[PDB]
Coordinates of all heavy atoms in Angstrom, one line a residue:
Chain T
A10 N -3.5 6.1 -10.3 CA -2.2 5.7 -9.8 C -1.8 4.4 -10.5 O -2.6 3.5 -10.7 CB -2.1 5.5 -8.3
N11 N -0.5 4.3 -10.9 CA 0.0 3.0 -11.5 C 1.3 2.6 -11.0 O 2.3 2.6 -11.8 CB 0.0 3.1 -13.1 CG 0.3 1.8 -13.8 OD1 0.2 0.7 -13.1 ND2 0.6 1.8 -15.0
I12 N 1.4 2.3 -9.8 CA 2.7 1.8 -9.1 C 2.4 0.9 -8.0 O 1.5 1.2 -7.2 CB 3.6 3.0 -8.8 CG1 5.0 2.6 -8.4 CG2 2.9 3.9 -7.7 CD1 5.9 3.7 -8.3
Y13 N 3.1 -0.1 -7.8 CA 2.8 -1.1 -6.8 C 4.1 -1.8 -6.3 O 5.1 -1.8 -7.0 CB 2.0 -2.3 -7.4 CG 0.8 -1.8 -8.1 CD1 0.8 -1.4 -9.5 CD2 -0.5 -1.6 -7.4 CE1 -0.3 -0.9 -10.1 CE2 -1.6 -1.2 -8.1 CZ -1.5 -0.8 -9.4 OH -2.6 -0.3 -10.1
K14 N 4.0 -2.2 -5.1 CA 5.1 -3.1 -4.5 C 4.6 -4.5 -4.8 O 3.6 -5.0 -4.2 CB 5.3 -2.8 -3.0 CG 6.7 -2.8 -2.6 CD 6.9 -2.7 -1.1 CE 6.7 -1.3 -0.6 NZ 7.0 -1.3 0.9
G15 N 5.3 -5.2 -5.7 CA 4.9 -6.6 -6.0 C 5.8 -7.6 -5.4 O 7.0 -7.5 -5.4
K16 N 5.2 -8.6 -4.8 CA 5.9 -9.7 -4.1 C 6.0 -10.9 -5.1 O 5.0 -11.3 -5.6 CB 5.3 -10.1 -2.8 CG 6.1 -11.1 -2.0 CD 5.5 -11.3 -0.6 CE 6.1 -10.4 0.5 NZ 7.4 -10.9 1.1
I17 N 7.2 -11.3 -5.3 CA 7.4 -12.5 -6.2 C 6.8 -13.8 -5.5 O 7.2 -14.1 -4.4 CB 8.9 -12.7 -6.5 CG1 9.6 -11.5 -7.1 CG2 9.1 -13.9 -7.4 CD1 8.9 -10.9 -8.3
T18 N 5.9 -14.5 -6.2 CA 5.3 -15.6 -5.6 C 5.7 -17.0 -6.2 O 5.7 -18.0 -5.5 CB 3.7 -15.5 -5.8 OG1 3.4 -15.4 -7.2 CG2 3.2 -14.3 -5.1
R19 N 6.0 -17.0 -7.5 CA 6.5 -18.2 -8.2 C 7.3 -17.8 -9.4 O 6.9 -17.0 -10.2 CB 5.3 -19.0 -8.6 CG 5.6 -20.2 -9.4 CD 4.4 -21.0 -9.9 NE 4.2 -22.3 -9.4 CZ 5.1 -23.3 -9.5 NH1 6.2 -23.3 -10.1 NH2 4.8 -24.5 -8.9
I20 N 8.5 -18.4 -9.5 CA 9.4 -18.2 -10.5 C 9.3 -19.3 -11.5 O 9.3 -20.5 -11.1 CB 10.9 -18.0 -10.0 CG1 10.9 -16.9 -9.0 CG2 11.9 -17.8 -11.1 CD1 12.1 -16.8 -8.1
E21 N 9.2 -19.0 -12.8 CA 9.2 -20.0 -13.9 C 10.4 -19.9 -14.8 O 10.3 -19.1 -15.8 CB 7.9 -19.9 -14.7 CG 6.7 -20.3 -13.9 CD 6.7 -21.8 -13.6 OE1 7.3 -22.6 -14.3 OE2 6.0 -22.2 -12.5
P22 N 11.5 -20.6 -14.5 CA 12.7 -20.5 -15.4 C 12.5 -20.8 -16.9 O 13.1 -20.1 -17.7 CB 13.6 -21.5 -14.7 CG 13.0 -21.9 -13.5 CD 11.6 -21.5 -13.4
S23 N 11.6 -21.8 -17.2 CA 11.4 -22.1 -18.6 C 10.6 -21.1 -19.4 O 10.5 -21.1 -20.6 CB 10.8 -23.5 -18.7 OG 9.4 -23.5 -18.4
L24 N 9.9 -20.2 -18.7 CA 9.3 -19.0 -19.3 C 10.0 -17.7 -19.1 O 9.5 -16.7 -19.6 CB 7.9 -18.9 -18.6 CG 6.9 -20.1 -18.7 CD1 5.6 -19.8 -18.0 CD2 6.7 -20.3 -20.2
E25 N 11.2 -17.8 -18.5 CA 12.0 -16.6 -18.2 C 11.1 -15.5 -17.6 O 11.0 -14.4 -18.1 CB 12.7 -16.0 -19.4 CG 13.6 -17.1 -20.2 CD 14.4 -16.4 -21.3 OE1 13.8 -15.7 -22.1 OE2 15.6 -16.6 -21.3
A26 N 10.4 -15.9 -16.5 CA 9.3 -15.0 -16.0 C 9.0 -15.4 -14.5 O 9.3 -16.5 -14.1 CB 8.1 -15.0 -16.9
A27 N 8.3 -14.5 -13.8 CA 7.8 -14.7 -12.5 C 6.4 -14.2 -12.3 O 6.0 -13.2 -12.9 CB 8.7 -14.0 -11.5
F28 N 5.7 -14.9 -11.5 CA 4.4 -14.4 -11.0 C 4.6 -13.5 -9.8 O 5.4 -13.7 -9.0 CB 3.5 -15.6 -10.6 CG 3.0 -16.4 -11.8 CD1 3.6 -17.5 -12.1 CD2 1.9 -15.9 -12.5 CE1 3.1 -18.3 -13.2 CE2 1.5 -16.6 -13.6 CZ 2.1 -17.8 -14.0
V29 N 3.7 -12.5 -9.8 CA 3.8 -11.4 -8.8 C 2.5 -11.0 -8.2 O 1.5 -10.8 -8.9 CB 4.4 -10.1 -9.5 CG1 4.6 -9.0 -8.5 CG2 5.7 -10.5 -10.2
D30 N 2.4 -11.1 -6.9 CA 1.3 -10.5 -6.1 C 1.5 -9.0 -5.9 O 2.4 -8.6 -5.1 CB 1.2 -11.2 -4.8 CG 0.0 -10.7 -4.0 OD1 -0.7 -9.7 -4.3 OD2 -0.2 -11.2 -2.9
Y31 N 0.8 -8.2 -6.7 CA 0.9 -6.7 -6.6 C -0.3 -6.1 -5.9 O -0.5 -4.9 -6.0 CB 1.2 -6.1 -7.9 CG 0.1 -6.2 -8.9 CD1 -0.9 -5.2 -9.1 CD2 -0.1 -7.4 -9.7 CE1 -1.9 -5.4 -10.0 CE2 -1.1 -7.6 -10.6 CZ -2.0 -6.6 -10.7 OH -3.0 -6.7 -11.6
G32 N -1.1 -6.9 -5.2 CA -2.3 -6.4 -4.4 C -3.7 -6.8 -5.1 O -4.7 -6.5 -4.4
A33 N -3.7 -7.2 -6.3 CA -4.9 -7.7 -6.9 C -5.1 -9.2 -6.6 O -4.2 -9.9 -6.1 CB -4.8 -7.5 -8.4
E34 N -6.3 -9.7 -6.8 CA -6.6 -11.1 -6.5 C -5.8 -12.0 -7.4 O -5.2 -13.0 -7.0 CB -8.1 -11.4 -6.7 CG -8.7 -12.2 -5.5 CD -9.0 -11.3 -4.3 OE1 -8.1 -10.9 -3.6 OE2 -10.2 -11.1 -4.0
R35 N -5.7 -11.6 -8.7 CA -4.9 -12.3 -9.7 C -3.5 -11.8 -9.8 O -3.3 -10.6 -9.9 CB -5.6 -12.2 -11.0 CG -5.1 -13.1 -12.1 CD -5.9 -13.0 -13.4 NE -7.2 -13.5 -13.1 CZ -8.3 -13.1 -13.8 NH1 -8.2 -12.2 -14.8 NH2 -9.5 -13.7 -13.5
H36 N -2.6 -12.7 -9.7 CA -1.2 -12.3 -9.8 C -0.8 -11.8 -11.2 O -1.4 -12.3 -12.2 CB -0.3 -13.5 -9.5 CG -0.4 -14.0 -8.1 ND1 0.2 -15.2 -7.6 CD2 -1.1 -13.5 -7.0 CE1 -0.1 -15.3 -6.3 NE2 -0.9 -14.4 -5.9
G37 N 0.1 -10.9 -11.3 CA 0.6 -10.4 -12.5 C 1.8 -11.2 -13.0 O 2.3 -12.1 -12.2
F38 N 2.3 -11.0 -14.2 CA 3.3 -11.7 -14.8 C 4.4 -10.7 -15.2 O 4.2 -9.7 -15.8 CB 2.7 -12.4 -16.1 CG 3.6 -13.3 -16.8 CD1 3.8 -14.6 -16.3 CD2 4.2 -13.0 -17.9 CE1 4.7 -15.5 -17.0 CE2 5.0 -13.8 -18.6 CZ 5.2 -15.1 -18.2
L39 N 5.6 -11.1 -14.8 CA 6.8 -10.2 -14.9 C 7.9 -10.9 -15.7 O 8.6 -11.8 -15.2 CB 7.3 -9.8 -13.5 CG 8.6 -9.0 -13.5 CD1 8.3 -7.7 -14.2 CD2 9.1 -8.8 -12.1
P40 N 8.0 -10.6 -17.0 CA 9.1 -11.2 -17.8 C 10.5 -10.8 -17.4 O 10.6 -9.6 -17.0 CB 8.8 -10.7 -19.2 CG 7.5 -10.0 -19.1 CD 7.2 -9.6 -17.7
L41 N 11.5 -11.6 -17.6 CA 12.9 -11.3 -17.3 C 13.3 -10.0 -18.0 O 14.1 -9.2 -17.5 CB 13.8 -12.4 -17.7 CG 15.3 -12.2 -17.5 CD1 15.6 -11.9 -16.1 CD2 16.0 -13.5 -18.0
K42 N 12.9 -9.8 -19.3 CA 13.2 -8.6 -20.0 C 12.7 -7.3 -19.4 O 13.2 -6.2 -19.7 CB 12.8 -8.7 -21.5 CG 11.3 -8.7 -21.7 CD 10.9 -8.6 -23.2 CE 9.5 -9.4 -23.3 NZ 9.7 -10.8 -23.0
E43 N 11.7 -7.4 -18.5 CA 11.1 -6.2 -17.8 C 11.7 -6.0 -16.4 O 11.1 -5.3 -15.7 CB 9.6 -6.3 -17.8 CG 8.9 -6.4 -19.2 CD 9.1 -5.2 -20.1 OE1 9.4 -4.1 -19.6 OE2 9.0 -5.4 -21.3
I44 N 12.8 -6.7 -16.1 CA 13.4 -6.6 -14.8 C 14.6 -5.7 -15.0 O 15.5 -6.1 -15.7 CB 13.8 -7.9 -14.2 CG1 12.6 -8.9 -14.1 CG2 14.4 -7.7 -12.9 CD1 12.9 -10.2 -13.6
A45 N 14.6 -4.6 -14.3 CA 15.7 -3.6 -14.4 C 17.0 -4.1 -13.7 O 16.8 -4.9 -12.8 CB 15.3 -2.3 -13.8
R46 N 18.1 -3.7 -14.2 CA 19.4 -4.3 -13.7 C 19.7 -4.1 -12.2 O 20.4 -4.8 -11.6 CB 20.5 -3.8 -14.5 CG 20.5 -4.4 -15.9 CD 21.0 -5.8 -16.0 NE 20.6 -6.4 -17.3 CZ 21.1 -7.5 -17.8 NH1 22.0 -8.2 -17.2 NH2 20.6 -8.0 -19.0
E47 N 19.1 -3.0 -11.6 CA 19.2 -2.8 -10.1 C 18.7 -4.0 -9.3 O 19.2 -4.1 -8.1 CB 18.6 -1.5 -9.7 CG 17.1 -1.3 -10.1 CD 17.0 -0.5 -11.4 OE1 17.8 -0.7 -12.4 OE2 16.1 0.4 -11.5
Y48 N 17.8 -4.8 -9.9 CA 17.3 -6.0 -9.2 C 18.2 -7.2 -9.2 O 18.0 -8.1 -8.4 CB 15.9 -6.4 -9.6 CG 14.9 -5.3 -9.3 CD1 14.5 -4.4 -10.3 CD2 14.4 -5.1 -8.0 CE1 13.6 -3.4 -10.0 CE2 13.5 -4.1 -7.7 CZ 13.1 -3.3 -8.7 OH 12.2 -2.3 -8.4
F49 N 19.2 -7.2 -10.1 CA 20.1 -8.3 -10.3 C 21.1 -8.4 -9.2 O 21.7 -7.4 -8.9 CB 20.8 -8.3 -11.7 CG 19.9 -8.5 -12.9 CD1 18.7 -7.9 -13.1 CD2 20.4 -9.4 -13.9 CE1 18.0 -8.1 -14.3 CE2 19.7 -9.6 -15.1 CZ 18.5 -9.0 -15.2
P50 N 21.4 -9.6 -8.7 CA 22.4 -9.7 -7.6 C 23.8 -9.6 -8.0 O 24.7 -9.4 -7.1 CB 22.1 -11.1 -7.0 CG 21.5 -11.8 -8.2 CD 20.7 -10.9 -9.0
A51 N 24.1 -9.7 -9.3 CA 25.5 -9.6 -9.8 C 25.4 -9.1 -11.2 O 24.3 -9.1 -11.8 CB 26.1 -11.0 -9.8
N52 N 26.5 -8.6 -11.7 CA 26.6 -8.1 -13.1 C 26.9 -9.3 -14.0 O 28.0 -10.0 -13.9 CB 27.8 -7.1 -13.2 CG 27.4 -5.8 -12.5 OD1 27.2 -5.8 -11.3 ND2 27.5 -4.7 -13.2
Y53 N 26.1 -9.6 -15.0 CA 26.2 -10.8 -15.8 C 26.9 -10.4 -17.1 O 27.4 -9.3 -17.3 CB 24.8 -11.4 -15.9 CG 24.4 -12.0 -14.6 CD1 23.0 -11.9 -14.2 CD2 25.2 -12.7 -13.7 CE1 22.6 -12.5 -13.0 CE2 24.8 -13.3 -12.5 CZ 23.4 -13.2 -12.2 OH 23.0 -13.7 -11.0
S54 N 26.9 -11.4 -18.0 CA 27.5 -11.3 -19.3 C 26.8 -10.3 -20.2 O 25.6 -10.2 -20.1 CB 27.6 -12.6 -20.0 OG 28.3 -12.5 -21.2
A55 N 27.6 -9.7 -21.1 CA 27.0 -8.8 -22.1 C 26.2 -9.6 -23.1 O 25.4 -9.1 -23.8 CB 28.2 -8.1 -22.9
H56 N 26.5 -10.9 -23.1 CA 25.8 -11.8 -24.1 C 24.9 -12.8 -23.3 O 25.3 -13.4 -22.3 CB 26.9 -12.6 -24.9 CG 27.6 -11.7 -25.9 ND1 26.9 -11.3 -27.0 CD2 28.8 -11.1 -25.9 CE1 27.7 -10.5 -27.7 NE2 28.9 -10.4 -27.0
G57 N 23.7 -13.1 -23.9 CA 22.8 -14.1 -23.3 C 22.1 -13.6 -22.1 O 22.2 -12.4 -21.8
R58 N 21.3 -14.4 -21.5 CA 20.5 -14.0 -20.4 C 20.7 -15.0 -19.3 O 20.8 -16.2 -19.5 CB 19.0 -14.0 -20.7 CG 18.6 -13.1 -21.8 CD 17.3 -13.4 -22.5 NE 17.4 -14.6 -23.3 CZ 16.8 -14.9 -24.4 NH1 16.0 -14.0 -25.0 NH2 17.0 -16.0 -25.1
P59 N 20.7 -14.6 -18.0 CA 20.8 -15.5 -16.9 C 19.4 -16.2 -16.8 O 18.4 -15.8 -17.3 CB 20.9 -14.5 -15.7 CG 20.2 -13.3 -16.1 CD 20.5 -13.2 -17.6
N60 N 19.5 -17.3 -16.0 CA 18.3 -17.9 -15.4 C 17.6 -17.0 -14.5 O 18.2 -16.3 -13.6 CB 18.7 -19.2 -14.7 CG 17.5 -20.1 -14.5 OD1 16.5 -19.7 -14.0 ND2 17.7 -21.4 -14.7
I61 N 16.3 -16.8 -14.6 CA 15.6 -15.9 -13.7 C 15.7 -16.3 -12.3 O 15.5 -15.5 -11.4 CB 14.1 -15.6 -14.2 CG1 13.4 -14.5 -13.4 CG2 13.3 -16.9 -14.0 CD1 12.2 -14.0 -14.0
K62 N 16.0 -17.6 -12.0 CA 16.2 -18.1 -10.7 C 17.4 -17.5 -10.0 O 17.5 -17.4 -8.8 CB 16.3 -19.6 -10.6 CG 15.0 -20.2 -10.4 CD 14.5 -20.0 -9.4 CE 13.8 -21.1 -8.6 NZ 12.9 -20.6 -7.5
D63 N 18.4 -17.0 -10.8 CA 19.6 -16.3 -10.4 C 19.4 -14.8 -10.4 O 20.4 -14.0 -10.4 CB 20.7 -16.7 -11.3 CG 21.0 -18.2 -11.2 OD1 20.8 -18.8 -10.2 OD2 21.4 -18.8 -12.2
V64 N 18.2 -14.3 -10.6 CA 17.9 -12.9 -10.6 C 16.9 -12.6 -9.5 O 17.2 -11.6 -8.7 CB 17.3 -12.4 -12.0 CG1 16.8 -11.0 -11.9 CG2 18.2 -12.7 -13.1
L65 N 15.8 -13.3 -9.4 CA 14.8 -13.1 -8.4 C 14.8 -14.3 -7.4 O 15.2 -15.3 -7.7 CB 13.4 -13.0 -9.1 CG 13.2 -11.8 -10.0 CD1 11.7 -11.9 -10.4 CD2 13.4 -10.5 -9.3
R66 N 14.1 -14.0 -6.2 CA 13.9 -15.0 -5.2 C 12.4 -14.9 -4.8 O 11.8 -13.8 -4.8 CB 14.7 -14.7 -3.9 CG 16.1 -14.7 -4.1 CD 16.9 -14.7 -2.8 NE 17.9 -15.7 -3.0 CZ 17.8 -17.0 -3.2 NH1 17.3 -17.8 -2.3 NH2 18.2 -17.5 -4.4
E67 N 11.8 -16.0 -4.5 CA 10.4 -16.0 -3.9 C 10.4 -15.1 -2.7 O 11.3 -15.2 -1.8 CB 10.0 -17.4 -3.6 CG 8.6 -17.8 -4.1 CD 8.3 -19.3 -4.1 OE1 8.0 -19.7 -2.9 OE2 8.5 -20.0 -5.1
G68 N 9.4 -14.3 -2.5 CA 9.2 -13.4 -1.4 C 9.8 -12.0 -1.5 O 9.5 -11.1 -0.8
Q69 N 10.7 -11.9 -2.5 CA 11.3 -10.6 -2.8 C 10.3 -9.6 -3.3 O 9.3 -10.0 -4.1 CB 12.4 -10.8 -3.9 CG 13.0 -9.6 -4.4 CD 14.2 -9.9 -5.3 OE1 14.5 -11.0 -5.6 NE2 14.9 -8.8 -5.7
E70 N 10.4 -8.3 -2.9 CA 9.6 -7.3 -3.5 C 10.3 -6.5 -4.5 O 11.5 -6.2 -4.5 CB 9.1 -6.3 -2.4 CG 8.1 -7.0 -1.4 CD 7.7 -6.1 -0.2 OE1 8.6 -5.5 0.3 OE2 6.5 -6.1 0.2
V71 N 9.5 -6.1 -5.6 CA 10.0 -5.3 -6.7 C 9.0 -4.2 -6.9 O 7.8 -4.3 -6.6 CB 10.2 -6.2 -7.9 CG1 11.4 -7.1 -7.7 CG2 9.0 -6.9 -8.3
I72 N 9.4 -3.1 -7.5 CA 8.5 -2.0 -7.8 C 8.0 -2.2 -9.2 O 8.8 -2.4 -10.1 CB 9.1 -0.6 -7.7 CG1 9.7 -0.5 -6.2 CG2 8.2 0.5 -8.0 CD1 10.4 0.8 -6.1
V73 N 6.7 -2.3 -9.4 CA 6.1 -2.5 -10.7 C 5.0 -1.5 -11.1 O 4.4 -0.9 -10.3 CB 5.5 -4.0 -10.8 CG1 6.6 -5.0 -10.7 CG2 4.5 -4.2 -9.7
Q74 N 4.8 -1.4 -12.4 CA 3.7 -0.8 -13.0 C 3.0 -1.8 -13.9 O 3.6 -2.7 -14.4 CB 4.0 0.5 -13.7 CG 4.8 0.4 -14.9 CD 5.0 1.8 -15.5 OE1 5.3 2.8 -14.8 NE2 5.0 1.8 -16.8
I75 N 1.7 -1.6 -14.1 CA 1.0 -2.4 -15.1 C 1.2 -1.8 -16.5 O 1.1 -0.7 -16.8 CB -0.6 -2.3 -14.7 CG1 -0.8 -3.0 -13.4 CG2 -1.4 -3.0 -15.9 CD1 -2.2 -2.7 -12.9
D76 N 1.7 -2.8 -17.3 CA 2.0 -2.5 -18.7 C 0.7 -2.9 -19.6 O 0.4 -2.2 -20.6 CB 3.1 -3.4 -19.1 CG 3.9 -2.9 -20.3 OD1 4.7 -2.0 -20.1 OD2 3.7 -3.3 -21.5
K77 N 0.1 -4.0 -19.3 CA -1.2 -4.4 -19.9 C -2.2 -4.8 -18.8 O -1.8 -5.6 -18.0 CB -1.1 -5.5 -20.9 CG -0.2 -5.3 -22.1 CD -0.7 -5.2 -23.4 CE -0.6 -3.9 -24.1 NZ -1.2 -3.9 -25.5
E78 N -3.3 -4.2 -18.8 CA -4.3 -4.5 -17.7 C -4.7 -6.0 -17.8 O -4.6 -6.6 -18.8 CB -5.6 -3.6 -17.8 CG -5.3 -2.1 -17.7 CD -5.0 -1.5 -16.4 OE1 -5.2 -2.2 -15.3 OE2 -4.5 -0.4 -16.3
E79 N -5.1 -6.5 -16.6 CA -5.9 -7.7 -16.5 C -7.0 -7.7 -17.5 O -7.8 -6.8 -17.5 CB -6.5 -7.8 -15.1 CG -6.1 -8.9 -14.2 CD -6.8 -8.9 -12.9 OE1 -8.1 -8.9 -13.0 OE2 -6.2 -9.0 -11.9
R80 N -7.1 -8.8 -18.3 CA -8.1 -9.0 -19.3 C -8.6 -10.5 -19.4 O -7.8 -11.4 -19.8 CB -7.5 -8.6 -20.7 CG -8.5 -8.6 -21.8 CD -8.3 -7.5 -22.8 NE -7.9 -6.2 -22.2 CZ -7.3 -5.2 -22.9 NH1 -7.1 -5.2 -24.2 NH2 -7.0 -4.1 -22.2
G81 N -9.8 -10.7 -19.2 CA -10.4 -12.1 -19.3 C -9.8 -12.9 -18.1 O -10.0 -12.5 -17.0
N82 N -9.2 -14.0 -18.5 CA -8.6 -14.9 -17.5 C -7.1 -14.6 -17.2 O -6.5 -15.1 -16.3 CB -8.8 -16.3 -17.9 CG -10.2 -16.7 -18.0 OD1 -10.9 -16.5 -17.0 ND2 -10.7 -17.2 -19.1
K83 N -6.6 -13.6 -18.0 CA -5.2 -13.3 -17.9 C -4.9 -12.3 -16.8 O -5.6 -11.4 -16.6 CB -4.7 -12.7 -19.2 CG -4.6 -13.7 -20.4 CD -3.9 -13.1 -21.6 CE -2.3 -13.2 -21.4 NZ -1.9 -14.4 -20.6
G84 N -3.7 -12.5 -16.2 CA -3.2 -11.5 -15.2 C -2.7 -10.3 -15.9 O -2.5 -10.3 -17.2
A85 N -2.4 -9.3 -15.2 CA -1.8 -8.1 -15.7 C -0.3 -8.4 -16.1 O 0.3 -9.2 -15.5 CB -1.8 -7.0 -14.7
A86 N 0.1 -7.8 -17.2 CA 1.5 -7.9 -17.6 C 2.2 -6.7 -16.8 O 1.7 -5.6 -16.9 CB 1.7 -7.7 -19.0
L87 N 3.3 -7.0 -16.2 CA 3.9 -6.1 -15.3 C 5.3 -5.7 -15.9 O 5.9 -6.5 -16.6 CB 4.1 -6.7 -13.9 CG 2.9 -7.0 -13.2 CD1 3.2 -7.7 -11.9 CD2 2.0 -5.8 -12.9
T88 N 5.8 -4.5 -15.5 CA 7.2 -4.2 -15.7 C 7.8 -3.5 -14.5 O 7.1 -2.8 -13.8 CB 7.3 -3.3 -17.0 OG1 8.7 -3.0 -17.2 CG2 6.7 -1.9 -16.9
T89 N 9.1 -3.6 -14.3 CA 9.8 -2.8 -13.3 C 10.3 -1.4 -13.8 O 10.8 -0.7 -13.0 CB 11.0 -3.5 -12.7 OG1 11.9 -3.8 -13.7 CG2 10.6 -4.9 -12.1
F90 N 10.2 -1.2 -15.1 CA 10.6 0.1 -15.7 C 9.5 1.1 -15.5 O 8.5 1.1 -16.2 CB 11.0 -0.1 -17.2 CG 12.1 -1.0 -17.4 CD1 12.0 -2.2 -17.9 CD2 13.4 -0.6 -17.1 CE1 13.1 -3.1 -18.1 CE2 14.5 -1.4 -17.3 CZ 14.3 -2.7 -17.7
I91 N 9.7 1.9 -14.5 CA 8.6 2.9 -14.1 C 8.7 4.2 -14.8 O 9.8 4.8 -14.9 CB 8.7 3.2 -12.5 CG1 8.7 1.9 -11.7 CG2 7.5 4.1 -12.1 CD1 7.6 0.9 -11.9
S92 N 7.6 4.6 -15.4 CA 7.5 5.9 -16.1 C 7.5 7.0 -15.1 O 6.7 7.1 -14.2 CB 6.1 5.9 -16.8 OG 6.1 4.8 -17.7
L93 N 8.5 7.9 -15.3 CA 8.7 9.1 -14.4 C 9.0 10.3 -15.2 O 10.1 10.4 -15.9 CB 9.9 8.9 -13.4 CG 9.7 7.8 -12.4 CD1 10.9 7.7 -11.5 CD2 8.5 8.1 -11.5
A94 N 8.2 11.3 -15.1 CA 8.4 12.6 -15.8 C 9.8 13.2 -15.3 O 10.1 13.1 -14.1 CB 7.3 13.6 -15.4
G95 N 10.5 13.6 -16.3 CA 11.8 14.3 -16.0 C 13.0 13.3 -15.7 O 14.1 13.8 -15.4
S96 N 12.8 12.0 -15.9 CA 13.8 11.0 -15.6 C 14.6 10.6 -16.8 O 14.2 11.0 -17.9 CB 13.2 9.7 -15.0 OG 12.4 9.0 -16.0

Side-chain angles (χ1 to χ4, degrees):
Chain T
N11 189 14
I12 191 168
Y13 309 88
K14 222 185 284 183
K16 187 171 268 274
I17 304 308
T18 56
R19 178 184 244 297
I20 302 164
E21 290 296 335
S23 75
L24 299 177
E25 309 185 305
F28 288 100
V29 181
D30 182 355
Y31 65 96
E34 226 81 287
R35 192 173 295 153
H36 296 175
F38 186 79
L39 177 63
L41 178 55
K42 68 174 150 297
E43 300 297 336
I44 304 179
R46 291 285 165 162
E47 52 265 42
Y48 299 101
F49 285 49
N52 292 57
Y53 291 140
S54 182
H56 289 285
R58 298 159 291 215
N60 196 315
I61 190 163
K62 267 298 223 197
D63 301 327
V64 174
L65 293 186
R66 303 191 130 301
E67 233 165 76
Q69 176 168 6
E70 291 170 321
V71 294
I72 300 174
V73 294
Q74 67 182 38
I75 296 167
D76 206 82
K77 301 247 114 184
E78 305 283 344
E79 240 186 54
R80 185 144 324 162
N82 294 307
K83 289 192 84 26
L87 295 176
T88 181
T89 64
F90 296 106
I91 307 304
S92 304
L93 294 177
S96 69

